[PDB]
DNA sequence: CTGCAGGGTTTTTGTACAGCCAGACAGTGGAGTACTACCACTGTGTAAGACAGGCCAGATC
């Protein structure tokens, strides 16, 4: 039941998946694992995501937050 | 049918080579950090009813 096992079982559960992903990256996008695996979530979730899919996906390195400028906080408070 | 027992199945759980990045450690000098205490003072308490005395007005002989 895929809830809490460690790395070295999912390893061979998805060896073929990651080999195919690397093959596709080498064929079409050069082989950048990060850019492929970050975008994999977009369409797989977006078939049926509520709205939080987009938030947690844009929660990437960009943005970012550290928090709002103190002026915006002051405006919220007053 | 039950019970246990060699081994199978596939799957885990971990140790194994071996190279290498990410963040903690020490420190510093002090800053600005961030979190606490101290200080007087607030709000929600919120209306009729019982009893004693004085007196007056209407009924009676």
From Swiss-Prot:
DNA-binding region: 1-62
Known tissue expression: In the adult, predominantly expressed in the thymus with lower levels in the pronephros, mesonephros and ovary.
Source organism superkingdom: Eukaryota
Extent of the signal sequence: none
Locations listed in the record: Nucleus
Subunit-level organization: Homodimer. Component of the RAG complex composed of core components rag1 and rag2.
Similarity annotation: Belongs to the RAG1 family.
Entry domain remark: The RING-type zinc finger mediates the E3 ubiquitin-protein ligase activity. The NBD (nonamer binding) DNA-binding domain mediates the specific binding to the nonamer RSS motif by forming a tightly interwoven homodimer that binds and synapses 2 nonamer elements, with each NBD making contact with both DNA molecules. Each RSS is composed of well-conserved heptamer (consensus 5'-CACAGTG-3') and nonamer (consensus 5'-ACAAAAACC-3') sequences separated by a spacer of either 12 bp or 23 bp.
Protein role: Catalytic component of the RAG complex, a multiprotein complex that mediates the DNA cleavage phase during V(D)J recombination. V(D)J recombination assembles a diverse repertoire of immunoglobulin and T-cell receptor genes in developing B and T lymphocytes through rearrangement of different V (variable), in some cases D (diversity), and J (joining) gene segments. In the RAG complex, RAG1 mediates the DNA-binding to the conserved recombination signal sequences (RSS) and catalyzes the DNA cleavage activities by introducing a double-strand break between the RSS and the adjacent coding segment.
Descriptive protein name: V(D)J recombination-activating protein 1
Organism encoding this protein: Danio rerio
């Amino acid at each position: 039941h895929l809830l809490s096992l460690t790395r070295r079982a999912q390893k061979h559960r998805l060896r073929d998946l990651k080999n195919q992903v690397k093959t596709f990256a080498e064929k079409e996008e050069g082989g950048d694992v990060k850019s492929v695996c970050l975008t994999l979530f977009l369409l797989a979730l977006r078939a049926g995501n509520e709205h939080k899919q987009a938030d947690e996906l844009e929660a990437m390195m960009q943005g970012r937050g550290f928090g709002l400028h103190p002026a915006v906080c002051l405006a919220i408070r007053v």
